[PDB]
Paper text:
There are four YD‐containing genes in humans ([name], YEATS2, MLLT3, and YEATS4). Despite high sequence homology (88 % YD alignment) and similar roles in complex formation, both [name] and MLLT3 appear to have independent roles in cancers such as acute myeloid leukaemia (AML). We have reported the discovery of the first small‐molecule inhibitors and a cell‐potent, selective chemical probe for [name] and MLLT3 YDs.
YDs demonstrate higher affinities for crotonylated lysine peptides over acetylated ones, which is thought to be related to the presence of a π‐π‐π network between the crotonyl double bond and residues F28, Y78, and F59 in [name].7 Docking studies revealed a potential interaction when compound 1 bound to [name] YD between the amide bond CO and backbone NH of Y78, in addition to the amide N‐H interacting with the side chain of S58.
Author numbering: 2 to 145
């Protein structure tokens, strides 16, 4: 009778391409990973920050974006599994969500990578304050 759910959508994705020639350091690939909303949505209303956990080999592997764009642009030798934490402007649980992102590169001779992973987040009975943020972001209220 006082229940609701608010669904919001996140898009995680990455692009990778084999450099025409490797960098001095022998980096073979450029890549970019991101978190975004669908078009006409503003996820910054409910996202405090996004944390991208790069392979321990990278300088400052804990890459924090506190405002859009939520992305990391890098060059590298190899794909890896990237924890991505999306922190919410929520005073209560859940305070964040963690994704395990498959940052895979294109093997020599394959076209560039351009992947998207769509994530629907369902908040059950958010606080008044957090519900407001989710809706401002373009979130959809479902009643029972
Ligand atoms: C454009 C600039 C901005 C700041 C730094 N950046 C250049 C840059 N510095 C870098 C420093 C390190 C790396 N490391 C990798 O690309 C990498 C290394 C080892 C990996 C994997 C996957 N698995 N494994 C282990 C062996 C099994 C990936 C890439 C770097 N790119």
């Amino acid at each position: 009778d006082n229940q609701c759910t608010v669904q919001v959508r996140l898009e995680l994705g990455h692009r990778a391409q084999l450099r025409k020639k490797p960098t001095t350091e022998g980096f073979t690939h450029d890549w970019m990973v991101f978190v975004r909303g669908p078009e006409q949505c503003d996820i910054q209303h409910f996202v405090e920050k996004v944390v991208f956990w790069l392979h321990d080999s990278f300088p400052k592997p804990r890459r924090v974006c506190k405002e859009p764009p939520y992305k990391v642009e890098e060059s590298g030798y190899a794909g890896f599994i990237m924890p991505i934490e999306v922190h919410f402007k929520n005073k209560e649980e859940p305070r964040k969500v963690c994704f395990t992102y498959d940052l895979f590169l294109n093997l020599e001779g394959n076209p560039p990578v351009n992947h998207l992973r769509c994530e629907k987040l369902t908040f059950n009975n958010p606080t008044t304050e957090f519900r407001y943020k989710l809706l401002r972001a373009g979130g959809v209220m479902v009643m029972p």
